[PDB]
Design a protein around this ligand. Sequence first.
Ligand SMILES: Cn1cnc(Cn2c(=O)nc(Nc3cc4cn(C)nc4cc3Cl)n(Cc3cc(F)c(F)cc3F)c2=O)n1
Ligand SMILES: Cn1cnc(Cn2c(=O)nc(Nc3cc4cn(C)nc4cc3Cl)n(Cc3cc(F)c(F)cc3F)c2=O)n1
Lengths: 306, 302
Amino acid sequence: SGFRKMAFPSGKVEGCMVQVTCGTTTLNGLWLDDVVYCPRHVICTSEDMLNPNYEDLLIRKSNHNFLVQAGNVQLRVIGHSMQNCVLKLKVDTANPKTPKYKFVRIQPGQTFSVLACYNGSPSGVYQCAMRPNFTIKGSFLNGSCGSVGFNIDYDCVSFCYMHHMELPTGVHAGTDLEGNFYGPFVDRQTAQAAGTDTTITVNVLAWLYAAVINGDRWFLNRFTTTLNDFNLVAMKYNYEPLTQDHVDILGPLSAQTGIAVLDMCASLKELLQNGMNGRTILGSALLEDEFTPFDVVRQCSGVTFQ
Amino acid sequence: SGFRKMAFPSGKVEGCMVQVTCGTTTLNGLWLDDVVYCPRHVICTSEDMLNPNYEDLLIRKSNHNFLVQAGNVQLRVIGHSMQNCVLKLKVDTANPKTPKYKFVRIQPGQTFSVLACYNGSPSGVYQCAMRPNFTIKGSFLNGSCGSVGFNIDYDCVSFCYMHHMELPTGVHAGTDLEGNFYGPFVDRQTAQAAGTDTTITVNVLAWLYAAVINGDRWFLNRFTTTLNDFNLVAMKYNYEPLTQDHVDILGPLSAQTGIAVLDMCASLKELLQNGMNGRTILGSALLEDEFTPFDVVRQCSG
Ligand SMILES: Cn1cnc(Cn2c(=O)nc(Nc3cc4cn(C)nc4cc3Cl)n(Cc3cc(F)c(F)cc3F)c2=O)n1
Ligand SMILES: Cn1cnc(Cn2c(=O)nc(Nc3cc4cn(C)nc4cc3Cl)n(Cc3cc(F)c(F)cc3F)c2=O)n1
């Protein structure tokens, strides 16, 4: 029993984090096979930045400029190239700690563990959620660029994120491992912010199902709504429209809890209106939207990810 | 910027987890050097649940009774001893993944990470705090015995918790790696219950300093309070008393933010008499108490 925000065991990823240095610029890199991936903003000087020309800035370089630091062993770079906003440094040695891995791109509302590293040395791990505004509410000090977000499926590490920058609002923005930025952003210093965020409704309903599994059953009413009626109330309170796909995903939790979706959307409708009346659900004084429905199965029913 | 709950990279502990099986009992084991640490409850059966004589049951097992499984590799147990509530198993191979480790015993209010493991297979990692009542509000299922709590300090793993049992309230009780239980609990099925939990005050004040560092500033006042007038109010709200030590440990946060500790104690005193009038601190609508002044300084700026 008990419920916590849980991340995947970051062991497999820690062996791939390396330090990449270009000029005075230093950040973290992901070393898989004989290639090191890092933000392409590493070849940037404050003299460029602002309005860059990465393709241009790129070619005019060398292979001894990039100091790929793996621990205190150095790596000979033998070729660079771009791929959207991610730079790939080809090095002479395959990473012997390379896991089963694939690059994936996540939809908003999906969750992933973040291994925040500073100067190639992993420092902390936590569990994030892709916000609807395509930002993540991370905790990143300076020099966090190159920190990677991932998930683990059996023994396959699914790299879905790479850190790039903090917005002035305080949230963070990055790309997938193929350079495609998450959201309406570019990798430079301009005044940038994204759309006003919204609650991931499907994750809140999965969090309520976890509270019922943990005996926290006070919010359960006796009523039932429709997807049409719920989404109309959901729009008012900056909640994401719940769709039919979202419903089917909550199927297992419904049958294992004995409740029902829409019946749960009845409780959430009331909670979105009355508030919680000074009570707490799983000890939280808000509504949590950082647990996907599969996250709740992994933490209450559960499988191990070695 | 941004303030998250942050556990340590569980990489070094994953390489130490094994699966210990004694008869039909299968919990997780901590493989360090040529010794495998695990809760001594693994040597129990159905009849031995309420009042086990573990010394009787231990001089009651042979080395061939223990099955240790690091991945596909079965390990050969060549000795079984007991120190308090943890069973120690000599194996003929040392774990080549063994880190720089040391066994420490934390005090209530100290935080640590937890690697939840099932059948020697790590499944997840999260951040706990040792509650003042010596339990932890962890997340654990059946098969999670042997899961360890830890902190990491310059690639040196400090093992400070080993999960043994879940209490009726749903909180969890375990031992240090020397087998000494945290709290008035014993590894038996005797109906047990922990004292009434309280909020770690010094952790809340540390979290409030972390909010002001992050520019957050919806909750400060012009007031100050005496340490005894603060403790008098905090105790009325199931809060821990604040010692002169706790005031000194909050020293460097009071320095880096220019807000004296007793000034912040007044800002907390006001917070408890009103609530939050809707507003949130660092995204929380409740007061956080699982960030030590160490973690707060760790995660925050300079
Ligand atoms: C507080 N915070 C939250 N997230 C971040 C991530 N982040 C970062 O780590 N570094 C950045 N600029 C650099 C300065 C360097 C100085 N040296 C010696 N080396 C440096 C390397 C970097 Cl990468 N930035 C700023 C930033 C980085 C970008 F890649 C980008 F496209 C726009 C930006 F404004 C940063 O946000 N820090
Ligand atoms: C739901 N939950 C959350 N945390 C825990 C911790 N925990 C555990 O993992 N296992 C326990 N009993 C066992 C039964 C077994 C059945 N087989 C085949 N093998 C078994 C092994 C164990 Cl270890 N317990 C109960 C428990 C374990 C103790 F070590 C103890 F001293 C008293 C207890 F009541 C448990 O709490 N479960």
